[PDB]
Amino acid sequence: TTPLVHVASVEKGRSYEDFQKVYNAIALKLREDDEYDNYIGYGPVLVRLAWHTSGTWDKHDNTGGSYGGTYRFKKEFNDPSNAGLQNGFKFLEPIHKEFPWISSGDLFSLGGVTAVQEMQGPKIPWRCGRVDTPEDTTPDNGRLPDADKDADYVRTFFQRLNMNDREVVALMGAHALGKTHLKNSGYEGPWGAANNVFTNEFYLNLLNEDWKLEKNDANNEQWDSKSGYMMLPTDYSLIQDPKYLSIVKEYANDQDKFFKDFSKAFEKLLENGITFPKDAPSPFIFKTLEEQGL
Ligand code: FMI
C-alpha cells in the first residue's frame, strides 16, 4: 500500500519532432471533424478528458493521476463522472492507431494541450514519459468533484490535487469552452458565446451577466442568464466567496495574466504524481498548425 513512485520514461528513442507530429495529427482532426456537438468541435471534450484522466489523483498516496492512462479500462471508462468522454476517446482512437508508440496517459494529456492551443489558448508546456499501468491500478469511481456544491467544498476538494485558490480559479476558466449536456451531467447549457475559442469570457460572464437560480429539466439547480448562458453552482460559488471573487475579477481584467496562470495550473494538473528524472527532456512547447503554416 506504500505510495508508489511513477518515474517518467521517454517512449523509446522519441523526441520533440515525434510528439509534434502527434500534436499535428490531433490538430488536423480537430479541424476536420468540425461538425461535432453542433459545430463546437472536439476541442472542449478533449480538454475535459485530459482533466478527468488527471483529476483522479490523490496527493496522499499518489494513486490515480495521468500517469497510468487507466481511463482505457472499463471501471474508469464507465465512471458516471466521465459520461460523455467516450466521444473524446473515440476521437483519439485513429490518432493512437497511427502512433501506437505513444502511451495512453501521454495521449490523453497531449489531447488537452493540443485542444487548448488550437483554440487560441495559451501555450501549455508538455512533458512526455507517462507509462501505461495495469488494470488493477485503475482508481475507483468517485474521485472526481461534484458540481452541486459551494465554495468551501471546492476549496477543500482541490487541496487533494495540491491546488490553491488561484490555481482553482484559473483552472475553472476552461469553462469558457464547450457546454454542459443534460444527458451527461444533469446540467444543460453553455457558459458563454465562444464555446470553441479559449478566452477569459468565463470570468466576464460571471461578473457581468444577470444570473437567476433556476431548475433545469433534470430537476437540478443551475444559474441562467437571459443571454442563454449558465453557471454551475460551483462556478457561481467563485463570486460568492470573497477570496475567489477577487481572483475572478483579476482574470476578468487581465487576459494575459489568466493565460499565464492557466498554463501553469493546467500543466501542473497534467503532471501531478509524476517524477521527472533530472536528465529528462525539458518540457516541449508545440507549435500550432497556424504557426507551422499547416
Ligand atoms: C482544466 C479544465 C477544467 C476543470 C479544472 C474543470 C473542473 C470542473 N468541472 Fe468542468 N469542463 C471542462 C473543463 C474543466 N472543468 C470543459 C472543457 C468542459 C466541456 C466539455 C464538453 O463541452 O464536452 C467541462 C464540462 C463540465 C460539465 C458538463 C459535462 C457535460 O454535461 O458534458 C460539468 C458538470 C463540469 C463540472 C466540473 C466540476 C465543477 C465538477 C467535476 C469541476 O470541479 N464540467
Q: Using CA atoms, how far apart are residues 98 and 189, in angstroms rounded to an integer? A: 35
Q: Using CA atoms, how far apart are residues 240 and 237, in angstroms rounded to an integer? A: 5
Residue 45 CB–ligand 1 contact under 6 Å: yes
The region, left, alpha or beta by phi > 0 then psi within -120 to 50, assigned to residue 273 is left
Q: Using CA atoms, how far apart are residues 146 and 226, in angstroms rounded to an integer? A: 25
Q: Could you give the angle at which helices 165-172 and 151-159 cross, rounded to 10 degrees?
A: 110
Q: Say whether 52 is catalytic.
A: yes
DSSP code string of the chain? -PPP-EE----TT--HHHHHHHHHHHHHHHHHSTTHHHHT-SHHHHHHHHHHHHTT-BTTTTBSSSTT-GGGSHHHHT-GGGTTTHHHHHHHHHHHHH-TTS-HHHHHHHHHHHHHHHTT-----B--------GGGPPPS--SPPSS--HHHHHHHHHTTT--HHHHHHHHGGGGSSEE-HHHHS--EESSS-TTS-SSHHHHHHHHS-EEEEE-TTS-EEEEETTS-EE-HHHHHHHHSHHHHHHHHHHHT-HHHHHHHHHHHHHHHHHTTEEPPTTSPPPB-PPPHHHHT-
Residue type present at position 117: Q
Q: Using CA atoms, how far apart are residues 230 and 190, in angstroms rounded to an integer? A: 6
Resolution of the experimentally solved model in angstroms = 1.7
Residue in 223, 27, 197 with CA at minimum distance from that of residue 110:
27
Can you say whether the dihedral through the CA atoms of 157, 90, 118, 203 is positive or negative? negative
**Contact criterion met (CB below 8 Å) for 44 and 77:** no
Q: Using CA atoms, how far apart are residues 264 and 150, in angstroms rounded to an integer? A: 25
CA of 78 to the centre of ligand 1 (A): 17
Distances (CA, A) of 97 to 60, 200, 286: 35, 35, 21
CA of 222 to the centre of ligand 1 (A): 14
Residue type present at position 280: A
* 198-64-16-265 Cα dihedral, nearest 10 degrees: 40
Residues 6+ positions from 175 with CB-CB distance below 8 Å: 191, 202, 232, 235
**Contact criterion met (CB below 8 Å) for 257 and 96:** no
Residue in 252, 109, 243 with CA at minimum distance from that of residue 176:
252
Catalytic residue among 6, 52, 96, 126: 52
* 93-98-103-107 Cα dihedral, nearest 10 degrees: -60
**Contact criterion met (CB below 8 Å) for 14 and 280:** no
The owner of cell 460571471 is 206
**Strand 221-225 to strand 211-215: parallel, antiparallel, or no bridges (unpaired)?**
antiparallel
The region, left, alpha or beta by phi > 0 then psi within -120 to 50, assigned to residue 37 is left
Give me the residues paired with residue 214 across strands: 222
Residues 6+ positions from 148 with CB-CB distance below 8 Å: 220, 221, 232, 233, 234
CATH, domain 145-265, list 3.30.499.10, 3.40.50.880, 3.30.300.30, 1.10.420.10? 1.10.420.10
Question: Where in the chain are the domains?
Answer: 4-144+266-294, 145-265
Q: Which fold has domain 4-144+266-294?
A: Peroxidase; domain 1 (1.10.520)
Angle 87-90-95 from CA coordinates, rounded to 5°: 135
Q: Say whether 181 is catalytic.
A: no
Mutate to test the pocket of ligand 1, among 175, 185, 244 (most ligand atoms within 8 A of CB): 175
Is 6 annotated in some ligand binding site?
no
CA 71 to chain centre: 14
CA 201 to chain centre: 17
N- to C-terminal Cα separation, the chain = 48
Experimental approach taken: X-ray
CA atoms within 13 A on the CB side of 113: 32
Q: Using CA atoms, how far apart are residues 235 and 223, in angstroms rounded to an integer? A: 9
Give me the residues paired with residue 72 across strands: none
Residue type present at position 265: A
